[PDB]
Amino acid sequence: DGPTMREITETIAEAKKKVLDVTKEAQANLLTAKHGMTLRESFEDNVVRFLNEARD
């Protein structure tokens, strides 16, 4: 459906925003550790998850 495609497009763009936000947070040394270590590992978890929640 047409309106469903609009919904699906704004969904992907909405998750993409969260990613950018978690990026700007990580880039400004504000992103917090995670027991599942590395600031870099930690950032990638948040990103990966956001994009998976998006596909689903």
Binding site: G2, M5, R6, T9, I12
Partner: protein, 43 residues
């Protein structure tokens, strides 16, 4: 006439490539829903 060049994988590491002349070249100076979503003229 220096319009087109030959690039190996080593030289590729130092260049920035456009996908389409349009899609990535003129600066910005409604949209088709059926069409697939592309990136930008970023730099």
């Amino acid at each position: 006439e220096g319009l087109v060049e030959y690039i190996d994988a080593e030289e590729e590491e130092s260049i920035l490539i456009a996908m389409q002349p349009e899609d990535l070249e003129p600066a910005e100076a409604d949209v088709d829903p059926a069409k697939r979503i592309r990136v930008s003229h970023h730099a």
